[PDB]
Design a protein around this ligand. Structure first.
Ligand SMILES: CCCCCCCC/C=C\CCCCCCCC(=O)OC[C@H](O)CO
Ligand SMILES: CCCCCCCC/C=C\CCCCCCCC(=O)OC[C@H](O)CO
Length: 181
């Protein structure tokens, strides 16, 4: 019975770590959306590939981010990564075999529950940011009246959606094992 708890604990911990790492990869990924020249943007840069092949990038203007949804998506992604770091750290200390200080199993269980919640919240923040970003792009693309540039969903959004799910599912596992102590 103890093996099963440890296995799920270990599994959930590595899932959370994987989700956090991918969240960081998502935030720094160049392809949040691509013009259906060729324009591709993330939360930080707006770029353009001119004929033929040459690509240039400019910083995503802060007023544009503020007047839109980008600055909000920035805040949710940054929060998610910070929460995931706090969760990874506390989760690492909360593992059964871990000897950082000299805490009993009960104190470890409390830490795992906190770490578990942090990963769930991190996945939630990432989930909202990706979805918020995605809906804005999708609404414009399928709008006949929309005169502006139309974008496709970028690969990073599928990476972020996966990352968030991994964080949530991982956090659930860690939290479940914590409740059993
Ligand atoms: C174990 C966990 C490991 C993974 C966790 C990694 C956390 C950091 C990764 C990405 C954050 C940075 C994303 C890219 C930041 C770009 C900053 C930039 O150059 O911005 C230019 C300008 O300010 C824009 O307007
Ligand atoms: C991704 C999947 C790799 C999962 C690898 C799972 C490796 C289990 C061994 C392990 O890392 O155990 C840590 C230990 O329980 C505490 O210090």
């Amino acid at each position: 019975s103890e093996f099963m708890s440890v296995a799920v604990e270990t599994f959930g911990f590595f899932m959370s770590a994987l989700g956090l790492l991918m969240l960081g990869l998502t935030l720094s990924n160049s392809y949040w959306r691509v013009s259906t020249n060729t324009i591709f943007e993330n939360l930080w840069y707006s770029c353009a590939t001119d004929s033929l092949g040459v690509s240039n990038c400019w910083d995503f203007p802060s007023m544009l981010a503020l007047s839109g949804y980008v600055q909000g998506c920035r805040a949710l992604m940054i929060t998610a990564i910070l929460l995931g770091f706090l969760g990874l750290f506390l989760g690492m200390v909360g593992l059964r075999a871990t000897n950082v200080g000299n805490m009993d199993l009960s104190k470890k269980a409390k830490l795992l529950a906190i770490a578990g919640t942090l990963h769930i919240l991190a996945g939630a923040c990432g989930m909202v940011a990706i979805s918020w970003y995605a809906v804005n792009i999708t609404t414009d693309f399928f709008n006949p009246l929309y005169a502006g540039t139309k974008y496709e969903l970028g690969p990073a959004l599928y990476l972020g959606w996966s990352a968030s799910l991994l964080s949530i599912l991982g956090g659930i596992c860690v939290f479940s094992t914590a409740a059993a102590s």
